[PDB]
């Protein structure tokens, strides 16, 4: 009865649902980290194989490790999916997404580029978005020797790993020197202004609410950010900034019920549609930032075929 529009199948998982409490990162990060680790245990590896890439910084930044991800058995180039794991900025680790990355590579026969990016706030903007540039630079230009098509490039992520991807893509279409076919933006963390309806009013909402949101830009700009209006945003950090969306790729956004990111999704997947850009733009009902780690239920059933539905069409011949 606190959230009465939940699928009554979520609802049932929210009496356990930790606290991910972006004010103590400590505690956040060993809660989180558990949460996925207890995940990461019994999961299959049947008919794919992991080995660890590493990717030259930016800059004289450190190397960037990738969890890439292959399918066994394969005559391949194949098609690879650059993905960035969620996690408000601050915490979080690629092996966190190896499920979802293992899917991909098992179902769909596409390698998967899982990136370990730098996390804020010990690494702030641009560090993080630099990572993962550096990473699609390297899958991008060793692409015969991975066995990867690099005409057939997506660059997805989930939350604050879709606004890493958003920003990455971005970047790329800027610099244009690699070419992405697909961009897949699950729960997308776009906007830190909170301006949005959803940002206003999702004050207490399940895993992210308005209190998470503020830590987390801070976290991720840094202790000279001062706020939603600084000026001095670059659109590679929050990407609902940016004013030319023409000529991105086409595009997946999802966004859930009750999450607080809800409005600045629907409002960028909007925005690239009035670009000219091909998106598919998915509102689930009944749903909360995060429900999909209940994956028993029938509407994160749904949304996680139509996820691989997607990526499969966006990356075809």
């Given at each position: 009865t606190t959230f009465p529009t939940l699928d009554p199948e979520?609802?049932?998982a929210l009496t356990m649902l930790?606290?991910?409490?972006?004010?103590d990162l400590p505690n956040a990060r060993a809660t989180y980290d558990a949460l996925i680790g207890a995940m990461l245990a019994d999961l299959s590896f049947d008919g794919v194989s992991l080995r660890e890439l590493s990717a030259p910084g930016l800059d004289g930044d450190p190397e960037v490790?990738?969890?890439?991800?292959?399918?066994?058995?394969?005559?391949?180039?194949?098609?690879?999916?650059?993905?960035?794991?969620?996690?408000?900025?601050?915490?979080?680790?690629?092996?966190?997404?190896?499920?979802?990355?293992?899917?991909?590579?098992?179902?769909?026969?596409?390698?998967?580029?899982?990136?370990?990016?730098?996390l804020a706030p010990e690494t702030t903007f641009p560090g993080p978005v630099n990572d993962c540039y550096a990473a699609l630079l390297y899958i991008h230009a060793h692409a015969e020797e991975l066995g990867i098509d690099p005409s057939r490039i997506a660059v997805g992520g989930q939350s604050a790993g879709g606004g890493l991807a958003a920003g990455t893509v971005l970047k790329a279409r800027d610099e244009g020197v690699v070419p992405v076919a697909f961009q897949f933006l699950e729960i997308p963390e776009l906007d830190d202004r909170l301006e949005t309806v959803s940002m206003t009013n999702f004050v207490d909402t399940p895993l992210w609410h308005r209190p998470n949101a503020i830590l987390s830009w801070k976290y991720y700009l840094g202790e000279s950010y001062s706020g939603p209006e600084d000026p001095d945003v670059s659109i590679y950090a929050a990407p609902s900034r940016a004013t030319d969306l023409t000529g991105l790729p086409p595009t997946y956004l999802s966004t859930m019920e009750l999450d607080p990111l809800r409005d600045e999704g629907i409002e960028y997947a909007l925005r690239l549609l009035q670009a000219g850009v091909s998106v598919e733009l998915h509102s689930f009902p009944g749903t909360f930032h995060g429900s999909?780690?209940?994956?028993?239920?029938?509407?994160?059933?749904?949304?996680?075929?139509?996820?691989?539905?997607?990526?499969?069409?966006?990356?075809?011949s």
């Open positions: 979520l609802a049932a930790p606290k991910v409490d972006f004010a490790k990738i969890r890439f991800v292959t399918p066994d058995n394969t005559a391949g180039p194949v098609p690879v999916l650059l993905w960035i794991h969620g996690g408000g900025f601050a915490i979080g680790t690629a092996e966190s997404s190896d499920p979802f990355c293992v899917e991909v590579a098992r179902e769909l026969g596409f390698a998967v580029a899982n990136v370990e990016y730098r999909a780690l209940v994956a028993t239920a029938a509407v994160s059933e749904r949304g996680a075929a139509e996820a691989l539905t997607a990526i499969r069409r966006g990356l075809r």
